[PDB]
């Protein structure tokens, strides 16, 4: 029967399911695309200037109140005074630039620094008299007197916007409000301080900040948990939404990119610097041989390389995801016992220390268990065909295991393996080979019974009959 290892793989592959027909948390469940359409429901957007191949927007940091701040009531009925105006501090400006960059990284927009003043298409400023929330901004369908503006609350009672930093609320607020200025709405109809909106007022279940920084609701509402951290950059649904407006940025990170520890992204939110780093990010990558390096954590992790999939990394739940249309090739676990799930292409999976469970999936995968008792799982013979077999690069007989327990042939067909030296037209016959000289080995199986191997796994290190679980 199916082993615990197989069940763990199967269970995580189906974790954080969305888009089904049944209700979730009393709400309809949306696919990434449906969520994107919903976020863009107001149909607001910037028009690319004539002669520009890509939308170009300048930004500036107000030095003094603009027309809107001086007489808000002339542009917004509800507001009479925004209190005391203050310019963005050096820290606020530096962080705003990182948030702007996180948006231009995923879609086709070129942001241009317009300095200090009111010359930018997008402007930033602080105010002290709350109008219901921590900040606000205007969609690009408003009159020029308000277009591109985002405002942030700062006073003796609220200091979250004073020191925005990687992973905190102040930084997400910048990313969120900037999102509005570019054309994104909250995933549902609600506004801070206006009435008493709750997650129950959401249009769809996935309206949480595990999927969109535009959401007002906690990631815990959908089962994720970032231990108090906040995504500093666009999430899964944000990426899909903004790309519907200005397209996918196919020039971004086309090199062999590493995310997590030892990152070469030069992006604070994609980088881990210690064993205590709380990572929260959605990967947008346009090409190359990429790796999710989570080697620096000790907690048991669950990593899923499929597009749109969420992973439990560094002790958090569903904090790492891969954007729709993105292909991440490799994954490196930490010192804990991890679950590494590959995708349809050839993946390099390294478990590291601990008793890991690796699942290459389709394609000829290079699997390293590392130290500890590791298990290499197969759920379909197509995952390691004789034509394109996986290679177990550090197999240790008596310690590691080749797990075929979930294969249909066994759990449903009741096939029994017969180890032989050569196929003779009998389904289930298997050949275990090993060359001491090259230290190379292999397992070949003829499931159909046509005397031809239809499943094979190459090995660097010997494997015996006892190392194979069925």
């Amino acid at each position: 029967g199916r082993s615990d290892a197989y069940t763990q793989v199967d269970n995580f592959l189906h974790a954080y399911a969305r888009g089904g027909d049944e209700l979730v948390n009393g709400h309809p469940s949306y696919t990434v695309d449906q969520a994107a359409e919903q976020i863009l429901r107001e149909q607001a957007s910037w028009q690319k200037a004539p002669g520009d191949s890509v939308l170009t927007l300048s930004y500036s940091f107000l030095t003094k109140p603009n027309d809107f701040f001086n007489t808000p009531w002339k542009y917004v009925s509800d507001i009479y005074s925004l209190g005391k105006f203050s310019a963005f501090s050096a820290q606020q400006q530096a962080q705003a630039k990182l948030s702007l960059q996180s948006w231009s990284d995923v879609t086709n927009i070129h942001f241009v620094d317009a300095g200090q003043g009111d010359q930018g298409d997008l402007t930033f400023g602080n105010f002290s008299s709350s109008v219901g929330g921590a900040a606000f901004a205007f969609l690009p369908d408003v009159p020029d007197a308000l277009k591109g503006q985002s405002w942030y609350l700062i006073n003796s009672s609220y200091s979250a916007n004073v020191n925005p930093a990687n992973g905190n609320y102040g930084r997400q607020t910048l990313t969120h409000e900037i999102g509005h200025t570019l054309g994104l709405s909250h995933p549902g109809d609600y506004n801070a301080g206006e009435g008493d909106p709750t997650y129950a007022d959401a249009t769809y279940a996935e309206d949480t900040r595990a999927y969109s920084v535009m959401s007002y609701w906690e990631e815990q509402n959908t089962g994720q948990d970032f231990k108090g951290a906040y995504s500093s950059a666009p999430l899964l649904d944000d990426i899909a939404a903004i790309q519907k407006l200005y397209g996918a940025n196919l020039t971004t990170r086309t090199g062999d990119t590493v995310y997590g520890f030892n990152s070469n992204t030069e992006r604070d939110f994609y980088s881990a610097t210690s064993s205590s780093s709380k990572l929260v990010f959605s990967v947008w990558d346009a090409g190359g041989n990429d790796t999710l390096d989570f080697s620096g954590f000790s907690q048991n992790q669950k990593i899923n390389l499929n597009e749109k999939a969420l992973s439990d990394v560094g002790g958090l739940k569903g904090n790492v995801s891969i954007a729709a249309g993105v292909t991440v090739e490799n994954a490196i676990g930490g010192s804990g016992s991890d679950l590494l799930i590959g995708n349809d292409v050839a993946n390099v999976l390294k478990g590291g220390a601990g008793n890991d469970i690796l699942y290459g999936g389709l394609g000829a995968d290079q699997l390293w268990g590392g130290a500890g008792a590791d298990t290499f799982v197969y759920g379909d013979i197509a995952e390691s065909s004789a034509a394109a077999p996986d290679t177990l690069r550090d197999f240790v007989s008596g310690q590691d295991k080749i797990d075929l327990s979930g294969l249909d042939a066994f759990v449903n067909g009741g096939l029994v393996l017969q180890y032989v030296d050569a196929f003779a037209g009998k389904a289930g016959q298997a050949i275990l080979s090993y060359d001491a000289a090259s230290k190379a080995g292999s397992l070949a199986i003829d499931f159909s019974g046509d005397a031809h191997a239809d499943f094979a796994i190459n090995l660097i290190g010997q494997a015996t009959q006892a190392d194979i679980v069925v």
Binding site: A134, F136, L153, Y158, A192, G193, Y216, E218, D225, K227
Partner: protein
């Protein structure tokens, strides 16, 4: 627009968590002293009472943009109480009931 993320000091004090209008109730003390391991703040009072509704006893908590989270030692959320209104946080029970957190007295 963004929700105001209240500080621990903004919510600190004596609170009660009870099932609907039923007698089942627990007295809690939300403190604003930091707890590093849980990435939150100290939760005092009769926290042991909470095991009547939770798998383990939470001894830490933290404000969220639209609620209050009760935490296990490592920082994971054991219970998220959504803000229904000023000083009124609630969560739906597994069965069908509702737990309500309101300031004491």
């Amino acid at each position: 627009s963004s929700l105001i993320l209240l500080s621990a000091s903004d919510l600190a004090g004596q609170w009660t968590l009870q099932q609907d209008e039923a007698p089942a109730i627990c007295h809690l003390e939300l403190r604003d002293s930091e707890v590093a391991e849980a990435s939150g703040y100290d939760l005092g009072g009769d926290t042991a009472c909470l095991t009547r509704w939770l798998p383990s006893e939470p001894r830490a908590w933290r404000p969220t943009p639209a609620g209050i989270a009760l935490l296990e030692r490592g920082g994971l959320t054991l219970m998220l109480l959504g803000r229904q209104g000023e000083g009124d946080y609630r969560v739906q029970k597994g069965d069908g009931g509702q737990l309500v957190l309101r300031r004491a007295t």
